[PDB]
């Protein structure tokens, strides 16, 4: 939850985007500081789903076949101490989509590969601020993502804000809008 | 942890594994190439795509099966597939050439010489496997690769393994439809080695899901991909126990127990009672008491068999979707109601019911519609002696003036072989018809 | 002080268990996490006898959950009450018994049994004063009716004195499900005879009867069937848990519910069964629950109570309510159907009120009845048991794993004995 | 590129493990649709009826 | 008043040191950049005793690092706590010396061993009253093992009086990874039984098992055991930084555990290690932990502690807690197992409370134990080195830095005297 | 910090030093013309050159020609490229007496120069092939110069041995023969490879029809690259060189270990594969995987080093070394029962581009020292005495100056060494 070190020095501003790139200038040779607060970051995210393995550590991420960046917000507390407050990840996968009629389609997306926030802040309107620097950074709307096996929380949020809700589901365990403007589908439905 | 292995033998069996494999990656979720897009997944539900699924250090997934044939070309496909990726390249076994549909060939010739290569791919498959439930197994009967690679692999499995569960799909012969004028040989002779070396087979007539796609499916022409979709849907609702959480589980323990009364009667039918084209499915509910008449239905027998000539002595009804025992109750009641469908005095409660949450899956572009709920009936009745004695018929009567005697005796083959597997498929009809009488 | 340790076995006892802990911790506000969030220290003066208390505010069931196959392990833990139970007691083999009493009571039964009673009996050393064990099993299936059987007679064994209650579910041809239960089930009659002080059969068709007409469930599952057999529950041991004017614990209703050792099979059932739409439709007073205690069409077991005379019934009741008007209203039940009770008993009725009722429920009755129609379900079962081995339908998988045809015989030979007995009484 | 420095050894786990306060204690509730939250909500499950 | 120096030699040495360091500040609430930021007034009443002054609300400790790899010193500089120490107590070399003990002790621990020992007494000299000297090291590595050996016998020679006491870690077969490291365990021990007052083993083997059992860890590094061994070791000396019921400081421990002066080496553990499931379901309590810290598993050593018969135990508690709860346990494990206690000391067993629990922690209990068992690792090094001997497995190497053979026979009698009298109170 | 020169004579030497400059340039991310931890192996010049620590000397042009027109022609600073006018012609007599005299004193004062330039000197590397003339006779020359100059700073080398079948030259057991007496004098540790080995395992391992010298001299560079990782590479139990041969030498004559690198396996099989810590340690001891045509089993290990790379957890190593112990079939010599030297790097392999590994996640290089090479000495002695006992090719050496008797005296170092091996491995 609290980190030692102050991350003003380090991160621009509170919310800071980390592409691959960015892991790669930000090393925990000397940086340990980013390193540690993404990866409890990830054992929270982990530990509050209640499953056997953690999915977001710095490790597999440098180490992940397709770029990914990262989406950290966190609060100035102390003069060397600070405080994790959320977490946001996202990348480029290719898959293969069917809509409803059981219509063949394929394109890249961006698949978000998770959500967290740290319990102590639950609520209160956390994480829309994340939404909403990403789909200003890299300048694409909501149907033009792919979710992987929401929970109830975020197609709640997905009708709270943009009103996308009715999320269609896909053989490979991912949900999107109902609204393909993709097209150019392989397969006649 | 549990896991199965699937073998597959034959230019059939082959097929049926390429299609049912689709099948799991699409209900599991994983790319053509072995990829799980679904990285949250992987820390949820890990039992279900580990049960089929082997874990790759560089997070990809690999199944657990064997692709074996004495020639290239239908393996070929795969390399050349879509799925060439998917399957790890050692256990797409490849023979130098095909058995030309000679069991002899198969069994003794051509098959010591990627026997031991099978073996030792499976002893490593088997090695990572931690919880291994059992094998399935998937070949066809009238062919000469296929039942000549089963018999010699079989026998050899076995000694291996022993208590493991050894599960088969084979496609059986059709009454009328014939596409080898050799294969009741071959069927004659792998009799014997099905009969000695399993715990259940499940016969298969390809002119029986012709007929079924004809009525149900409206499609007039069907190919061999339809059938190997349907297949792949029985499998995998069989399957589904084992990898899915549902009220009152039904393994392969339990199925084994059920449904083989004794050691020499683990032949049961096999049928997916909901089967129906997409626009004709609209206009039904299906709810559980319709499907679950359909499933007694002669016309949605995947067999060329009469049950109205027979009797039913155990039934198992996986269902899969959403269904509560109360529907399963009143459907069982409705169907011990009446007469027409005639079960064995001596087995009272010959009913063994399994029900998962799963829904069943549809492929994209798929023949089976999209459908809450769907059921796979498994029944051992003595239906089946009638197929098995038009195949001793017409096995005499071919052998009766020795038409193709000498192209087995070639190939390191006894003449009293054939004596000894038809008195052996003799003796079995006569268990059944033992076994088939009231007391 | 007098503490109690649960047993679950089977996926179905597994299930009933796991509802017991929720309704019980309900009753004793207990919260899911494991902290204690009651109002009442009456809830709170005697918890002892489920929950062991880990000190900082914090409760654990004294139950041990296991079965064969992990998968139901995992299930419960994954369930919304699962985070509350003590994970080494979660104990499992390898994988489910196949419905094969031989496979859980003499090889798989035979591994893991070894383990269950070390951790049964670390267990139960940490009590007081542990008055017996109460233990959820299903006849139907492989792995309850085998090792939980086993496990039965080792606790038997290892504990001579403490009160044993095995509150079972036994199968009906009604609503079979398993082809091979009649075997499992007339391979248990006989432990459960000779090594249990109270057993409470339960059957499935009766909870879908119950459900469908008394209480008109619309598709009620195996949820609403646990949740009915739990309310049994937590109604036969109200009184160790809070005061009340008649003060009864397992032992007295053992000794008035068993006027011999081989007739303790018992038959429960629930007063306050009543539909949602029908709540205003009757009002709740003394007279219609003891009516509906002794109703046919309320019991929980399948037999119908009219063929049988009751040898001696229980009413455990809880809520404020005058003691008088119980006695009233019992003795008028024994008084208009005394040819439903048997002559040679003087009172065949004995009773006991609690002062603490279920939550939602102004106050409740737990009825329990020693009847003779018992024997009705056993005869079903004898008979199919006969049908299946006048032909041995499965009796080589069982040979296989070490069975023979001397323990089906002695099996079949006790039951029919103990049908004997009842018809012996039956006059 | 440059040399990659992995944190997993350097991980400190036994760190929360030692220390008796644990943010543990709240479960991520499973997904209705799902055939985990299919089967808690109907064979777990039981809908109030008195 | 009772200031403690501490020197961190070799790779293993400065990580252990390192994470000590850092449970330290964790313990006293210290900023890594060396500011105050607790939350209690009680832990700045005994912080002199580990850091020292710097004035403005800044505390450095009063750690010497050396180590004969620059790279050691610059993982630990830039890692997490790496600006808590200051610039001037840093000693480093040019190039490690090899694993070997002659190349570490003779000629490049010689020359380095002049500002080692001058940083350490400008250190020594700004004290109040210096307690003691405290350094943490490897037996199985050729820098730590020669440069701890050296600097002891100076610090000896050059401070009579001090305790002294070495947290070595013994190497073990099991977890070998070194080929000439039983030469460099044997040239050590001399030197430990010589000039320390007491060695506390621990074997990375044990370590391995202990996380693997009782922590169930799914895949231990070096940072869980050096988290382990930091927490024993503060532990250890709790009794100096804060108050408690019975204050046993280093002077009255090392008073209380050796009989004789040359039986010096202690065998240490610590109670509270909880898997994570069962963190919030164990109610830990004095019997809990006394029962822990007397297991066999828990122990550090991999030599069984039930393979010998305890000299002396001691077991340090923290928190509040009545002292005769503590008395009770500690009578009951003296009668109970009786047998693993020598009967010629009247109390086997030390006692002692600290108020002050570890942060985050209800209350801990460190436990060290002076048993005959630690022979076995004596025993295994003698034979191993033994082996190595009888063939002139790698003297080609150590000779070549002009050490004399002569003086493996002799350490190896020495290391059967150590064995013989242990040996002797072994019965 | 922690500086080591490499030095590369005769044309396999010189590529294979190619190879390896190449990986660490792609390992580093230093480009190929110099443009941009690596001071290992690299001197950072003020202008942000990176010039590699690095001598290339050759008596023929022509494969230095190569470097100085190929892609690295900017990489290395034109003094470190010594060329001569004419090849030793596969004559050790040639290479080392008449010839190699002429530039031995520049390739030794550019030695000096370089390692004057660095503080912390390791040691020395040495790539060249026994077979070869040049390889053969100006590397004893140039390497016995340098251990008298120097002498107790290490000096390792990574030698090409002739194959049982493989011979490209005819007179190579005779140049073999010749350097293998210096071999023993001076290097402090040397590394024999063989070509056939390498062959073979490309055969059978990546599959490759058709194999050449790249795939020799990148799977060279990745076993140098991974010894000489713990320099420059952060990670849990680092295995210096000073380590490294206290570690393998348990005499000091017997410093010639074998090589090999364990995760070689085909890309379109990699993905399939989990590539456990117990499975590639377990795959190490394969027979067939040793890069040095001779059978484990026949001999008895002595010592033996592993050096993990990437993910790699000790536990997980512990239970390897264990599981290998339990294995009889690796036998060990009675008196090193722990003679396992476990090294681990956080460091993961990269790939060469067009190369035919794959990215593996972990790899380990596993360095033993056994009785089984002897079969190799067995092999060149027994050619030598053939080819000997009529005396073939005698004139040619006797006319270049070194004497008759000098043939007899190597003989009897190879046949000592030879008794030596064989003694070392009695029980005791
Ligand atoms: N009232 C309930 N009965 C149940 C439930 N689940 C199963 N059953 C009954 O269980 C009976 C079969 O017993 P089990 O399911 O425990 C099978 P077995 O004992 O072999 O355990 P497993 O091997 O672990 O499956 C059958 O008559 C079912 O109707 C449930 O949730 N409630
Ligand atoms: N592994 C490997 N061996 C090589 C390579 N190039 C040459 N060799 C070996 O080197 C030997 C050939 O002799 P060289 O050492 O090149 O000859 P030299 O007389 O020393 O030097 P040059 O005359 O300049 O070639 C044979 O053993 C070859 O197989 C290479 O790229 N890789």
Same mark, same amino acid.
């Given at each position: 939850?609290?980190?030692?070190?102050?991350?003003?020095?380090?991160?621009?501003?509170?919310?800071?985007?980390?592409?691959?790139?960015?892991?790669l200038?930000?090393?925990?040779?000397?940086?340990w500081?980013?390193?540690?607060?993404?990866?409890?970051?990830?054992?929270?995210?982990?530990?509050?789903?209640?499953?056997?393995?953690?999915?977001?550590?710095?490790?597999?991420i440098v180490?992940?076949?397709?770029?990914?960046?990262?989406?950290?917000?966190?609060?100035?507390?102390?003069?060397?101490?600070?405080?994790?407050?959320?977490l946001?990840?996202?990348?480029?996968?290719?898959?293969?989509?069917t809509?409803?009629?059981?219509?063949?389609?394929?394109?890249?997306?961006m698949?978000?590969?998770?959500?967290?926030?740290?319990?102590?802040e639950?609520?209160?309107?956390?994480?829309?601020?994340?939404?909403?620097?990403?789909?200003?950074?890299?300048?694409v709307?909501?149907?033009?993502?792919?979710?992987d096996?929401?929970?109830?929380?975020?197609?709640?949020?997905?009708?709270?804000?943009?009103?996308?809700?009715?999320?269609?589901?896909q053989?490979?365990?991912?949900?999107?809008?109902?609204?393909?403007?993709?097209?150019?589908?392989?397969?006649?439905? | 942890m549990?896991?199965?292995?699937?073998?597959?033998?034959?230019?059939?069996?082959?097929?049926?594994?390429?299609?049912?494999?689709?099948?799991?990656?699409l209900?599991?979720?994983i790319?053509?190439?072995?990829?799980?897009?679904?990285?949250?997944?992987?820390?949820?539900?890990?039992?279900? *795509?580990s049960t *089929?699924?082997?874990?790759?250090?560089?997070?990809?997934?690999?199944?657990?099966?064997?692709?074996?044939?004495?020639?290239?070309?239908? !393996?070929?496909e795969?390399?050349?597939?879509?799925?060439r990726?998917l *399957?790890?390249?050692?256990?797409?076994?490849?023979?130098?050439?095909?058995?030309?549909?000679?069991?002899?060939?198969?069994?003794?010739?051509?098959?010591?010489e990627?026997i031991?290569?099978?073996?030792?791919?499976?002893?490593?498959?088997?090695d990572?496997?931690?919880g291994?439930?059992? *094998?399935?197994?998937?070949?066809?009967?009238?062919?000469?690769?296929?039942?000549?690679?089963?018999?010699?692999?079989?026998?050899?499995?076995?000694?291996?393994?022993?208590?493991?569960?050894?599960?088969?799909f084979?496609?059986?012969?059709?009454?009328?439809?014939?596409?080898?004028?050799?294969?009741?040989?071959?069927? !004659?002779?792998?009799?014997?080695?099905?009969?000695?070396?399993?715990?259940?087979?499940?016969?298969?007539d390809?002119?029986?899901?012709?007929?079924?796609?004809?009525?149900?499916?409206?499609?007039?022409?069907?190919?061999?991909?339809?059938?190997?979709?349907?297949?792949?849907?029985?499998?995998?609702?069989?399957?589904?126990?084992?990898?899915?959480?549902?009220?009152?589980? =039904?393994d392969?323990?339990?199925?084994?127990?059920?449904?083989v009364?004794?050691?020499?009667?683990?032949?049961?039918?096999?049928?997916?009672?909901?089967?129906?084209?997409?626009?004709?499915?609209?206009?039904?509910?299906?709810?559980v008491?319709?499907?679950?008449?359909?499933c007694?239905?002669p016309?949605?027998?995947?067999?060329?068999?009469?049950?109205?000539?027979?009797?039913?002595m155990? =039934?198992?009804?996986?269902?899969?979707?959403?269904?509560?025992?109360?529907?399963?109750?009143?459907?069982?009641?409705?169907?011990?109601?009446?007469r027409?469908?005639?079960?064995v005095?001596?087995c009272?409660?010959?009913?063994?019911?399994?029900?998962?949450?799963?829904?069943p899956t549809?492929?994209?572009?798929?023949?089976?519609?999209?459908?809450?709920?769907?059921?796979?009936?498994?029944?051992?009745?003595?239906?089946?002696?009638?197929?098995?004695?038009?195949?001793?018929?017409?096995?005499?009567?071919?052998?009766?003036?020795?038409?193709?005697?000498?192209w087995?005796?070639?190939?390191?083959?006894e003449?009293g072989?054939?004596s000894?597997?038809?008195?052996?498929?003799?003796?079995?009809?006569?268990?059944?018809?033992?076994?088939? =009488?009231?007391? | 002080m007098?503490?109690?340790?649960?047993?679950?076995?089977?996926?179905?006892?597994?299930?009933?268990?796991?509802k017991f802990?929720?309704?019980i911790?309900?009753?004793?506000?207990?919260?899911?996490?494991?902290?204690?969030?009651?109002?009442?220290?009456?809830?709170?003066?005697?918890?002892?006898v489920?929950?062991?208390?880990?000190?900082?505010?914090?409760?654990?069931?004294?139950?041990?959950?296991?079965?064969?196959?992990?998968?139901?392990?995992?299930?419960?833990?994954?369930?919304?009450?699962?985070?509350?139970?003590?994970?080494?007691?979660?104990?499992?083999?390898?994988?489910?018994?196949?419905?094969?009493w031989?496979?859980?009571?003499?090889?798989?039964?035979?591994?893991?049994?070894?383990?269950?009673?070390?951790?049964?009996?670390?267990?139960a050393?940490?009590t007081d004063?542990?008055?017996?064990?109460?233990?959820?099993?299903?006849?139907?299936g492989?792995?309850?009716?085998?090792?939980?059987?086993?496990?039965?007679?080792?606790?038997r064994?290892?504990?001579?004195?403490?009160?044993?209650?095995?509150?079972?579910?036994?199968?009906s041809?009604?609503?079979?499900?398993?082809?091979?239960?009649?075997?499992?089930?007339?391979?248990s009659?006989?432990?459960?005879?000779?090594?249990?002080?109270?057993?409470?059969?339960?059957?499935?068709?009766?909870?879908?009867?119950?459900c469908?007409? %008394?209480?008109?469930?619309?598709?009620?599952?195996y949820?609403?069937?646990?949740?009915?057999?739990?309310?049994?529950?937590?109604?036969?041991? %109200?009184?160790?848990?809070?005061?009340?004017?008649?003060?009864?614990?397992?032992?007295?209703?053992?000794?008035?519910?068993?006027?011999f050792?081989?007739?303790?099979?018992?038959?429960?059932?629930?007063?306050?069964? %009543?539909?949602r739409?029908?709540?205003?439709?009757?009002?709740?007073?003394?007279?219609?629950?003891?009516?509906?205690?002794?109703?046919?069409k309320?019991?929980?077991?399948?037999?119908?109570?009219?063929?049988g005379?009751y040898?001696?019934?229980?009413?455990?009741?809880?809520?404020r309510?005058?003691?008088?008007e119980?006695?009233e209203?019992?003795?008028?039940?024994?008084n208009?159907?005394?040819?439903?009770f048997?002559?040679?008993?003087?009172?065949?009725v004995?009773?006991?009120?609690?002062?603490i009722?279920?939550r939602?429920?102004?106050?409740?009755?737990?009825?329990?009845?020693?009847?003779?129609?018992?024997?009705?379900?056993?005869?079903?079962?004898?008979?199919?048991?006969?049908?299946?081995?006048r032909?041995?339908?499965?009796?080589?998988?069982?040979?296989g794993?070490?069975?023979?045809?001397?323990?089906?015989?002695?099996?079949?030979?006790?039951?029919?004995?103990l049908?004997?007995?009842?018809?012996?009484?039956?006059?």
């Open positions: 939850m609290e980190i030692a070190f102050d991350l003003s020095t380090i991160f621009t501003d509170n919310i800071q985007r980390l592409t691959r790139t960015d892991l200038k930000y090393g925990p040779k000397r940086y500081a980013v390193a540690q607060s993404i990866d409890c970051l990830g054992e929270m995210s982990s530990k509050f789903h209640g499953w056997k393995r953690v999915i977001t550590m710095y490790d597999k180490d992940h076949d397709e770029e990914q960046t990262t989406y950290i917000m966190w609060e100035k507390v102390n003069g060397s101490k600070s405080i994790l407050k959320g946001l990840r996202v990348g480029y996968k290719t898959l293969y989509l809509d409803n009629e059981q219509n063949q389609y394929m394109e890249k997306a698949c978000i590969l998770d959500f967290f926030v740290v319990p102590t639950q609520r209160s309107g956390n994480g829309f601020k994340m939404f909403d620097e990403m789909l200003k950074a890299e300048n709307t909501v149907d033009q993502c792919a979710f096996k929401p929970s109830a929380a975020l197609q709640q949020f997905l009708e709270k804000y943009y009103d996308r809700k009715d999320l269609v589901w053989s490979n365990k991912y949900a999107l809008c109902s609204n393909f403007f993709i097209g150019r589908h392989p397969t006649v439905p | 549990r896991e199965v292995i699937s073998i597959h033998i034959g230019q059939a069996g082959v097929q049926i594994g390429n299609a049912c494999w689709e099948l799991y990656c209900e599991h979720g790319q053509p190439d072995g990829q799980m897009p679904s990285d949250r997944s992987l820390g949820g539900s890990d039992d279900s *795509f *089929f699924f082997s874990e790759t250090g560089s997070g990809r997934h690999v199944p657990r099966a064997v692709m074996v044939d004495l020639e290239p070309t239908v !393996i070929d795969i390399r050349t597939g879509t799925y990726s *399957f790890h390249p050692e256990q797409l076994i490849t023979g130098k050439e095909d058995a030309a549909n000679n069991y002899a060939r198969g069994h003794y010739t051509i098959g010591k990627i031991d290569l099978t073996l030792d791919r499976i002893r490593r498959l088997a990572n496997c931690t291994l439930q059992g *094998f399935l197994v998937f070949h066809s009967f009238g062919g000469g690769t296929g039942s000549g690679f089963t018999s010699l692999l079989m026998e050899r499995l076995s000694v291996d393994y022993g208590k493991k569960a050894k599960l088969e084979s496609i059986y012969p059709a009454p009328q439809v014939s596409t080898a004028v050799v294969e009741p040989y071959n069927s !004659i002779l792998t009799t014997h080695t099905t009969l000695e070396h399993s715990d259940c087979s499940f016969m298969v390809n002119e029986a899901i012709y007929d079924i796609c004809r009525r149900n499916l409206d499609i007039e022409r069907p190919s061999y991909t339809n059938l190997n979709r349907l297949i792949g849907q029985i499998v995998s609702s069989i399957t589904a126990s084992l990898r899915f959480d549902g009220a009152l589980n =039904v392969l323990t339990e199925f084994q127990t059920n449904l009364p004794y050691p020499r009667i683990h032949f049961p039918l096999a049928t997916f009672s909901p089967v129906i084209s997409a626009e004709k499915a609209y206009h039904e509910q299906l709810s008491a319709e499907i679950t008449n359909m007694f239905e016309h949605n027998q995947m067999v060329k068999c009469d049950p109205r000539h027979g009797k039913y155990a =039934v198992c009804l996986l269902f899969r979707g959403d269904v509560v025992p109360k529907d399963v109750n009143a459907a069982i009641a409705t169907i011990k109601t009446k027409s469908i005639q079960f005095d001596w009272p409660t010959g009913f063994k019911v399994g029900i998962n949450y799963q829904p549809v492929v994209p572009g798929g023949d089976l519609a999209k459908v809450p709920r769907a059921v796979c009936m498994l029944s051992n009745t003595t239906a089946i002696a009638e197929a098995w004695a038009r195949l001793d018929h017409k096995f005499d009567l071919m052998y009766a003036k020795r038409a193709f005697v000498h087995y005796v070639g190939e390191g083959m003449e072989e054939f000894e597997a038809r008195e052996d498929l003799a003796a079995l009809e006569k268990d059944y018809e033992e076994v088939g =009488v009231d007391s | 007098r503490e109690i340790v649960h047993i679950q076995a089977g996926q179905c006892g597994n299930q009933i268990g796991s802990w929720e309704v911790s309900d009753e004793h506000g207990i919260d899911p996490s494991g902290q204690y969030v009651g109002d009442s220290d009456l809830q709170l003066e005697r918890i002892n489920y929950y062991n208390e880990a000190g900082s505010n914090k409760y654990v069931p004294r139950a041990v959950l296991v079965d064969l196959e992990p998968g139901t392990m995992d299930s419960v833990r994954s369930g919304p009450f699962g985070q509350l139970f003590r994970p080494d007691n979660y104990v499992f083999g390898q994988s489910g018994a196949g419905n094969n031989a496979k859980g009571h003499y090889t798989e039964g035979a591994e893991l049994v070894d383990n269950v009673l070390d951790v049964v009996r670390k267990e050393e940490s004063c542990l008055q017996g064990f109460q233990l959820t099993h299903s006849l139907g492989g792995t309850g009716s085998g090792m939980g059987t086993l496990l039965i007679s080792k606790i064994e290892e504990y001579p004195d403490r009160i044993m209650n095995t509150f079972s579910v036994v199968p041809p009604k609503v079979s499900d398993t082809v091979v239960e009649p075997y499992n089930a007339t391979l009659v006989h432990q459960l005879v000779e090594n249990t002080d109270s057993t409470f059969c339960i059957d499935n068709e009766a909870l879908y009867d119950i469908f007409r %008394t209480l008109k469930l619309t598709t009620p599952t949820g609403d069937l646990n949740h009915l057999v739990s309310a049994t529950m937590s109604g036969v041991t %109200t009184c160790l848990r809070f005061p009340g004017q008649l003060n009864a614990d397992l032992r007295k209703l053992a000794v008035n519910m068993v006027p050792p081989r007739l303790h099979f018992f038959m429960p059932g629930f007063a306050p069964l %009543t539909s739409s029908n709540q205003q439709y009757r009002a709740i007073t003394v007279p219609e629950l003891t009516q509906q205690c002794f109703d046919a309320n019991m929980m077991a399948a037999c119908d109570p009219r063929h005379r040898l001696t019934a229980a009413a455990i009741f809880r809520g309510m005058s003691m008088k119980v006695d209203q019992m003795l008028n039940i024994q208009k159907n005394s040819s439903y048997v002559d040679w008993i003087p009172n065949n004995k009773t006991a009120v609690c002062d009722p279920p939602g429920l102004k106050m409740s009755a737990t009825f329990i009845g020693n009847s003779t129609a018992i024997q009705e379900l056993f005869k079903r079962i004898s008979e199919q048991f006969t049908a299946m081995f032909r041995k339908a499965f009796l080589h998988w069982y040979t794993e070490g069975m023979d045809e001397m323990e089906f015989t002695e099996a079949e030979s006790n039951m029919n004995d049908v004997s007995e009842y018809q012996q009484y039956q006059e």
